Design a protein around this nucleic acid. Sequence first.
DNA 1: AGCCGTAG
DNA 2: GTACCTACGGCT
DNA 3: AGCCGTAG
DNA 4: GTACCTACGGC
Lengths: 671, 672
Amino acid sequence: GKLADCSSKSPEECEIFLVEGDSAGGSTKSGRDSRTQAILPLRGKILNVEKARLDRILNNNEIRQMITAFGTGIGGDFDLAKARYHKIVIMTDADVDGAHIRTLLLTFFYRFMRPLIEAGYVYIAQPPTGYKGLGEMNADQLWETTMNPEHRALLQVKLEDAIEADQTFEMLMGDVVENRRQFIEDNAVYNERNITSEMRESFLDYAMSVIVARALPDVRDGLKPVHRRILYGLNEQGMTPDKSYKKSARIVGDVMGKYHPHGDSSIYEAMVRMAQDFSYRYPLVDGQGNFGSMDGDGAAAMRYTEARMTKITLELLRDINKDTIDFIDNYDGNEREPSVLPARFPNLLANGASGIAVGMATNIPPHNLTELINGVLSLSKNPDISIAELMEDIEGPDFPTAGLILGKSGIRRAYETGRGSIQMRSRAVIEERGGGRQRIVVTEIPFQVNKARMIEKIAELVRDKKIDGITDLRDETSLRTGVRVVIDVRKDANASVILNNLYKQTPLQTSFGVNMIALVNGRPKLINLKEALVHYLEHQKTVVRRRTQYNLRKAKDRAHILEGLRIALDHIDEIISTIRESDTDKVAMESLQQRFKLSEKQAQAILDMRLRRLTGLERDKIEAEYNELLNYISELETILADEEVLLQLVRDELTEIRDRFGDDRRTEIQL
Amino acid sequence: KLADCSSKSPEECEIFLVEGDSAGGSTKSGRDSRTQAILPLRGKILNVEKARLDRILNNNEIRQMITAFGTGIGGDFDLAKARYHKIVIMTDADVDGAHIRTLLLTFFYRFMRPLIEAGYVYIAQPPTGYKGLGEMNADQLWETTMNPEHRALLQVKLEDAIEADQTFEMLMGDVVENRRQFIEDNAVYINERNITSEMRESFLDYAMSVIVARALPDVRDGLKPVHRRILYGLNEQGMTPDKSYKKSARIVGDVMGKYHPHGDSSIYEAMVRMAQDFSYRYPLVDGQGNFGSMDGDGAAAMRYTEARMTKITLELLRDINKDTIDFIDNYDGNEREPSVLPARFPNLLANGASGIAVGMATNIPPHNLTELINGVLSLSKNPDISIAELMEDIEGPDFPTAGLILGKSGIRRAYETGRGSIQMRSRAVIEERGGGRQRIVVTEIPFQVNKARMIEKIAELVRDKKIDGITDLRDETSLRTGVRVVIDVRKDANASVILNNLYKQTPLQTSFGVNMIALVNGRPKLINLKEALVHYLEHQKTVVRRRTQYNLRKAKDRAHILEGLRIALDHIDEIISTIRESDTDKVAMESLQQRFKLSEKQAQAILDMRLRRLTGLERDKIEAEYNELLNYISELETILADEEVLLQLVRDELTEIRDRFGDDRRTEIQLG
DNA sequence: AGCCGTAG
DNA sequence: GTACCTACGGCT
DNA sequence: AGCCGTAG
DNA sequence: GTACCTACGGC
Ligand SMILES: O=c1ccc2ccc(F)c3c2n1C[C@H]3CN1CCC(NCc2cc3c(nn2)OCCO3)CC1
Ligand SMILES: Cc1sc(-c2ccccc2Cl)cc1C(=O)N[C@@H](CN)c1ccccc1
Ligand SMILES: Cc1sc(-c2ccccc2Cl)cc1C(=O)N[C@@H](CN)c1ccccc1
Ligand SMILES: [Mn+2]
Ligand SMILES: [Mn+2]
Ligand code: NA
């Protein structure tokens, strides 16, 4: 019913185009030749049939619609002669997700409709380079470039080696992660088409993009691109804590247009989590309005909420405009965006990260800011510090939701190797409720556990009689009292046994599996605690050194200008005479340069000077600024002359941040 | 969706009805969960006053409320079974919140009246300034509206049941005229609440806002608030035709934050229509990407499309920064927006308008711009011109979709009175297809007719055997050929007969019901063709008059500065020494003013002068500017001194616009 | 009828 | 006004 | 086995 | 990635 067929009933001259969604589909339908060309719009990512059970595959709506459209049936019953189109054309967006969707479609054609490929019926379209998605093209341009048999370039998909192609679909699309990961590491780098070559190149294109530009944080600032773009967007709009909140829909529309060419919900939902004090150990966004709850209620629609940077986020963006980090071109070349943030606090470890990539994933727990900075300071004084010594500063993860960690052994393994299992428990106590009866009271729950869902789980166990001795279950949580979950215990039953059982059978006890993978030098890397801290500290040294160099050039440039102004003030009569005698700006400029040994920049500055600069207060200000400047330049040079002084400055600034933003440990690590 | 409280004891339990999930989550968090339950609604609710019982009972929102209350409904209503003794209506403090409140009270009065009689129904009073309950933090919601310690609730009271019956009937019933009369009669520019009063005030607030601030165009620029805000948003962001396309998501978020506090889809779809050349006779938006089709395909998601002003839209905004129109504060006081656009072409008539309001609706067809401007010119030369004479310029509507209008008699009635029915017919011809067989070919369809859907209607008629003689039906439309819909006719059947039947039984012939209502001085008004031209010409006289006055004010301000600069350069050594000798800015200003007879503004301008202005070509170059200004000042004064000269200037600027943007008529008017 | 177009 | 489909990895 | 979070 | 509720007035 989503299919827009062509009028001809002769398959030999008929072509069906497969496109990503209705955005693309509408340009496609308007621009086509309705006589011979059909359009079937799909719905974004389609089922990977290499990983799915067969009944699921047969019951999936997108899959059925293709089968019905092609008309050949599937597997054993496939009948090539019954095909309704001799050309099946894959026309996804010319981007990395476009590529993924193509690997998913080919995988379906190969496993289920193979003769179709063998017959040479499957092609790949080749839309132009410039556009965002096909939804961004005018129908006429899409017709000429991509669908016009006269000018289009199609690739026909050719099946050459079928042993090789089976091995290929299994490797890329199959359920064994390791083989796929190996394939990516090995190949990762910075009109007839063999189906194996198309899968390998298209999948690597997608997989690479997800690893380096989506799902993994950078080790230096702890951010993924969508977060870095959000925060940079708030900086560039002047959405500072002192400044008022800006509506979220404007922030999101802004980020979308300038830096992040993806769907609005991905951006808004990333921003929302950054504002949740139950998600971020040190929240990066300050939100006004409904930003979700521990119960998994979603945030209010973006038209209603407002947001701005938290104060600690200013520390992430500090000195970004002092040539501290490298800018790069944005997605369409009309803007510039930061490659990384200055990150004056160790954000990766402080807020942690979780991302599902391709071939790999990352799980990094959050940490206490005071402990992390103290760890960085200990490292700065001792490059050969061991993990055990570092743990004297950093006890373990510190969750925003507090709770308990059981033992140091999982933490120790994770810090040493980057992988460990950490056991988390809710904070629970047994107390009397009167009448000789007792209750269990939970005041803190494990990190990332949905409270309401945890309670549902307990209720279901009680209902199914899978747990004994619970008379009542209520959520007494309130803004005023904090989290409070009350489990009433049957009189004379052992509450401690019931609690132990709750730990065994519900998320009241949950584990955090540490998998510390981050982008180091543009590549994913499993890193230990020390390595994550070493990368953070080198970054801070580079940022501070660069800021100091930038500030020196700027101060020197400004001093240069002020010397010219001071010269002008010393010979103001002569300066005025020279300018009056000149016919043009260009002559005056040359004459000032010749007569007073001034640079072009100095002369330009003098010619720009307003007459009010001539008053007593203004002359003094020019002289006062120059004298202030000379001292500043001397201070900057001192820092750059001595690596130790530079390093000390890094330590001092970290320390300042520690004292301003460092807070108490929340999570209790129990021996 | 219900988030219930702990207590089982209704006497102390309260249920809060909120607009959506946006307010629901803050409400869930902020409430006392022991005694406060939350039921989020799904925006506007069924009006039970206009609906039959089967539809009422099958509505999910009505069902959830019935289920939650526990009382049952109507005849089976049981007050004792109520699960809460306080049912609290908590919508946003805005016009649409007020509407939701009338809809809820309508359901309660009709299906659960004892609940009101018992005193169980209340209205919360959240604070204003928020633009949504989703906007408030949970602690603010609790303290201001849900905490029993600080909250102010209105208990709804039923005093006169006869009067309330009548009020619910008039405000919410199916008779539009009584409701329209109520709005016309009442419209104008400590813990208990009478239900009749609450209904009359809440409904009037909503109805008036929709009439004056949503669904009806201004007679002066032909726009509704959302369209005006979009265009002003484009001008402000500098999205002119010379600049590159801006992404739609960014344009929309900007309009949302700054001027239009409503949904993104309302803004984006309004912008998309301005871009469609099958909708707008002179498109106001230049769109890049998928902007929808005549088959009712919607535009691509806003993440993909880009947009900017068309060239003609520059004429809507021309002179906006010369104090030609009044600006007003935006919705939250942080911005300024235009009350109306200068509108240098008659956009109301040119592009037409359709809007469903409350108590009334509007339907104004588009027109040919060359014709309209000629009409305005003729009118400007003769205030007593008649409609018939005006029709010598303005033949009738001119649809972007072309086609035919049958006869001039509906056009005439609509122009004379503002109401008329106009028959639009497709352009269709009969031609041979070979073998002695024929086809009907359609290349133009009526305005606002979905082509795919019209084709479906035809296919339906053929399959149901309600029409004889059709053997095939195809849409051969393409970019190369334009609309082409082909109906094959059975050999030896009369094709003209088949075509006449298709006109009678399908949208291939359709009617446009003209009902020209626009806002005139802030009030809706049914207007005829001449009255719409008159208000337009007045607006233009006013814009040009104000523009001239602004320019004159500006030019004198400038001449004044230059007289100070002339004096400064003539005495420059003494000027500089005066400044050098002054300790501060203030002292220099006083000294310059006393010594050289300079105003405060002249002296500031002298102190702001850069040294590079002392170069040679300046004494004369300043004198060059000063000389042109005097001439210009004289030119502006002449215009303000003679109405006829001002009127001629309006005529001239309209004529230039007609020659630059005026195009050929598309819709053919056949007599008859 | 169910559409048209700004709203929740 | 709102609700689900899909990919992807690892842990239970 | 369903969840975590950026994506279509 | 997409689909389907509601108000409102007139034909
Ligand atoms: O609830 C439901 C339930 C079902 C359903 C089905 C199909 C279907 F399409 C949808 C459904 N829905 C909701 C709806 C899906 N939504 C996703 C979000 C999208 N938002 C656009 C947007 C706004 C912006 C912006 N960019 N883009 O830039 C900044 C300003 O605001 C609008 C469509
Ligand atoms: C999947 C990819 S892509 C990539 C790469 C290479 C070069 C340029 C750009 C990129 Cl993106 C490297 C790997 C990879 O697996 N690296 C190994 C290191 N042993 C590994 C194994 C396990 C965990 C993390 C890392
Ligand atoms: C419904 C409203 S509100 C309003 C009004 C009054 C005063 C201030 C602000 C406002 Cl908005 C006037 C009417 C109305 O019906 N006007 C009559 C013309 N007398 C009408 C009748 C039929 C068609 C159009 C217009
Ligand atoms: Mn894409
Ligand atoms: Mn509202
Ligand atoms: Na008809």
